[PDB]
């Protein structure tokens, strides 16, 4: 996260760290959606152009964290992966269209003050909240700058951007499964996700029922916090039918 601030304790209890066993390192963010399921970006697990193809055994998920590097004894829970599911139409060859993956945990994680799942939107929640101007919130332990790393979980609130503006900001083909967010240049405020934040959640607080819904997954950008550029997020509601299928079938 670039130009964000330190997260408060328990501010994002669905935030998950995707952790590589060896060499020990942060791979990506992710989010807790129930006691057995974690949502992330497909490209955090599978990206052939860079020889990335992780198996269950290569990875751990760390839940309930604040500090990036510290082992948070009595706070975080570390879970093993039972099975990875990648959207069958995830487009890694071109533009990361449908950048989404689910991970089933070997055992249910116990909820606590620091560990609690986020809601997934339904048709109605998406319709009312996913509007240009409406702000969402992105958290992660990714880079503080495009060109280092934070001591603790970072947070930034960013407005959803009009679709024509998203399209005109880039040469990449944008699809209905993506939305972009971020401030325009000279607005007086900045902020963006960055490398290492991917797979993390873009959440919004419903003013109807006071619940947090994950509307997006940090997906891609051309640099971090550049003027006239915006972060792109997997549109979670558009892919909810696949989410439900995987869960109903294998959960």
């Amino acid at each position: 996260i670039v130009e964000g601030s330190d997260a408060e304790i328990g501010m994002s209890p669905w935030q998950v760290m995707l952790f590589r066993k060896s060499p020990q390192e942060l791979l990506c963010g992710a989010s807790l959606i129930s006691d057995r399921w974690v949502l992330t970006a497909a490209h955090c697990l599978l990206y052939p152009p860079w020889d990335k193809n992780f198996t269950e055994n290569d990875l751990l998920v760390r839940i309930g964290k604040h500090s990036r590097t510290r082992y948070e004894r009595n706070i975080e829970k570390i879970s093993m992966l039972e099975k990875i599911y990648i959207h069958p139409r995830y487009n890694w060859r071109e533009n990361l269209d449908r950048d989404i993956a689910l991970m089933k945990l070997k055992k249910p994680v116990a909820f606590s003050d620091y560990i609690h799942p986020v809601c997934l939107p339904d048709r109605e929640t998406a319709a009312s909240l996913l509007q240009a101007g409406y702000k969402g919130r992105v958290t992660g332990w990714g880079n503080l700058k495009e060109t280092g790393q934070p001591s603790v979980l970072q947070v930034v609130n960013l407005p959803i951007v009009e679709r024509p503006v998203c399209k005109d900001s880039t040469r990449i083909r944008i699809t209905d499964n993506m939305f972009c967010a971020g401030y325009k240049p000279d607005e007086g405020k900045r902020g963006d996700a960055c490398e290492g934040d991917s797979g993390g959640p873009f959440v919004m607080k419903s003013p109807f029922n006071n619940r947090w819904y994950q509307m997006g997954i940090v997906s891609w950008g051309e640099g971090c916090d550049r003027d006239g550029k915006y972060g792109f997020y997997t549109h979670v509601f558009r892919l909810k039918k696949w989410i439900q299928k995987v869960i109903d079938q294998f959960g």
Partner: peptide, 28 residues
């Protein structure tokens, strides 16, 4: 069923430092 309600915030009726910024943006 209890999704999206944070034990240290919603559950205790405390607000974090910037959630109000989100609410203020939901003008429509």
């Amino acid at each position: 069923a209890d999704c999206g309600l944070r034990p240290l915030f919603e559950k205790k009726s405390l607000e974090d430092k910037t959630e109000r910024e989100l609410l203020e943006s939901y003008i429509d």
